[PDB]
């Protein structure tokens, strides 16, 4: 008769592997706060550390 698909064993398939992008959204940029300045560059990086200057 036939080879008859009702007979042969069918496999399955997996294709790895995917990241799912995340909501909710976060933007609110650019704005305050944006735009790095220098005086802060004196602030953060060591040495002569904080806490914060005047």
């Amino acid at each position: 008769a036939y080879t008859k698909i009702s007979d042969v064993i069918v496999p399955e398939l997996f294709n790895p592997y995917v990241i799912n992008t995340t909501t909710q959204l976060s933007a609110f940029f650019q704005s305050g706060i944006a735009a790095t300045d220098d005086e802060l560059n004196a602030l953060a990086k060591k040495a002569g550390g904080g806490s914060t200057l005047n």
Partner: protein
């Protein structure tokens, strides 16, 4: 650790109508001790970067 103490004693009256007697030797002991010690110290980190030196 051991040791052998040195001999001592009288000579004798070298005489007839009698005989001599031989004599002996002794031994002795000594000890010691093993001892052992140590300590440790440490720091934080945040403090290191904030203080200006290590």
């Amino acid at each position: 650790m051991p040791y052998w103490n040195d001999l001592d004693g009288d000579s004798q009256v070298l005489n007839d109508t009698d005989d001599l007697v031989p004599q002996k030797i002794n031994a002795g002991q000594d000890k010691a001790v093993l001892i052992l010690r140590g300590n440790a110290w440490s720091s934080h980190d945040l403090a290191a970067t904030l203080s200006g030196s290590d």
